[PDB]
Every structure is written in C-alpha cells, then in structure tokens.
Amino acid sequence: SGFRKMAFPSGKVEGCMVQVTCGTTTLNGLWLDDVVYCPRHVICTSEDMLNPNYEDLLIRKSNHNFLVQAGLVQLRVIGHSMQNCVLKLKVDTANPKTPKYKFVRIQPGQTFSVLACYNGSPSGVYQCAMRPNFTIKGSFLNGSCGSVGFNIDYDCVSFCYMHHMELPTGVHAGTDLEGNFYGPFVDRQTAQAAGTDTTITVNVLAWLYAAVINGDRWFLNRFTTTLNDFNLVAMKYNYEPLTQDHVDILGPLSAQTGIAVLDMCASLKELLQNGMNGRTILGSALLEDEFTPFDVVRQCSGVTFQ
C-alpha cells in the first residue's frame, strides 16, 4: 500500500550522460551508440542567445571544438550535424552502456522521469508531465540543459525530452530527441510566455482511483454525471475536456475498484465545486494530475524493469 510520485530507475540513463563543452559553454549530452545528442545552443554565448543565427554560428565550429567527456575519459568527435534544435556529435566509440532505446514524441498529459545532470554528472531523478501548454514544471539550474526525460518499458528506454530553456515564469521548455520543441517555444531568449496551465482531467481521475485502492475514500459521494455535464464544470475550472477515449483508458481502474468512471467524475465535480475542506487525498491538499492511468496501474501492481 501507499502511493508515491515515483520515477523510473535511472541507471540505464546514467550510463549515457556525458559533458559537452563548446568554447565557454558546458552542458549535458546523451551518448547512445556512436552519437552524442545535445542542445544546439551549446554553440552560443550568453550574448548570442538574444538573436542567434545557428547555421551561421555553426560555420565557426569544427569537430575538435566540441569537447565531449564521459566521466574522466575524453571522446573523439569524428562528425557533427544540426537536426532541428539538437546537435548530433558522431564519436569514434559506441557507448558500451547503450541500453535498448527508442525516441518518442509524447502527447500533453503524458508523464516521464527526468535525470537532472550538471557537467555530465547525474544529480537527481524526478517525475514530470508534459503540460497541456507544452511546458514542464521541472527543477533545472544553469548547466542542466541536455538533461533528458524518459520512460522505461521492461528493458527499453523511450527518450522523450531534452531540456533547453527556462521561461521567465520559471517553467521549462525543451525538445524531443529529434530536436523539435514541444509546443511553440524556441531556443532564443525572447518574450515567449506559456498559455493556460490546464489540469489533466484523466490523470486526476486516475489518481482518485489510486486513492480508493489505497484506502482514501472520503470523497466518494452518492452522485453520478455525464461527460457533457462534467465538462461544463471542467471548463469553468480550467480542466481539459474529458473524452470517451479518456473514459475507455480508465476502464481497467474502473473494473478493479467497481467505481464507474462517471461516478468518479461526479466525485471530482464535487471536489472542484466544494474544495477539500481542509482534508487530504494521498497526502495532498490539491488534485494531483501528474499520474497517468498507466502510472497508477503500474505502481499499484508492482511492474518492474530489466
């Protein structure tokens, strides 16, 4: 019993972290097979970041300008290229610790673990979600760029995020491993602001199921609702509209607990309209939205990984 914000074990990703230095800038890279992936802004000065022309800046860089270090051992760079907002640095040695892996582009609402690193060295691991506004709420200091987010299924690491930017409001933006930003963000220091931080309704419902499984049931009520009635309340509270697809995804948790999805929606509706009245659910005083249905099933059943 018990339900915690849980990250994937980080060891398979730790073995892939390197330090990348270009001129005066040091950040992290991800070493998989014979390629190191890192943010293209490694080539910028702080001055450059206001209005960088990456293609032009890159002309002045050769393979030997990209210093790649794995622990205390230097890697030899034999080629480099820009793909969208990442650089791919070809090295002469395949990472002997390369796990089975895939590159995935996730949808808003999906969760993942972040291995925060500095100077190629892991500092901590924590769980995030891709927000509906395409930011993430991370913990990233200067030097953390190039840290990655990932999910694991058994023995395969699916990398879904590389960290690039902090907005002036303290939230975070980044790319998939093909170098395409999530949402509308760019690797320039400009006036870009995040849109509404909508609550991920299907995840809140999953977490309410987790609460019931783990003994917290005070919020269950005598009511039901419909998708359309619930969504009229979801809209008022800046919740994502709940779809039939979301209902179907909650099916297994509905079956395990015997609580119909629309009944749980009615419990959530009452929580939104009435608040918590100073009570808690799974040690939280707000409605948690960074557990997916699959996260809840995984943690409540004990799924492990090679």
Binding mask 212-251 toward ligand RQH (x if CB under 6 A, else -) reads: ----------------------------------------
Using CB under 8 A, which of 94, 100, 102, 124 touches its own copies? 124
Residue 45 interface partner, choices ligand RQH, its own copies, none, CB cut-off 5-8 Å depending on type = none
Q: How far is the CB of 248 from ligand RQH (least distance, A)?
A: 20
d(CA 148, CA 145): 9
22 catalytically annotated: no
E strand or H helix at 210: helix 201-213
Other CB atoms within 10 A of residue 60 CB: 9
First to last CA, the chain: 23
41 catalytically annotated: yes
Two tokens, residue 61: 């860089």
Other CB atoms within 10 A of residue 45 CB: 13
DSSP class per residue in 113-175? EEEEEETTEEEEEEEEE--TTS-B-----TT-TT-EEEEEETTEEEEEEEEEEE-TTS-EEEE
Using CB under 6 A, which of 34, 178, 229, 270 touches ligand RQH? 178
79 or 170: whose CB is closer to its own copies?
170
Nearest to 131 by CA among 147, 155, 152, 112: 112
61 or 105: whose CB is closer to ligand RQH?
105
Per CB under 6 A, contacts with ligand RQH among 89-118 are 103-105
Residue 100 in the binding site for its own copies (CB under 8 A): no
Active site members: 41, 145
- Site residues, ligand RQH (CB under 6 A): 103-105, 176-178
- Site residues, its own copies (CB under 8 A): 1-12, 14-15, 71, 115-119, 121-126, 137-144, 166, 170-172, 214-215, 275-276, 278, 280, 283-286, 298-306
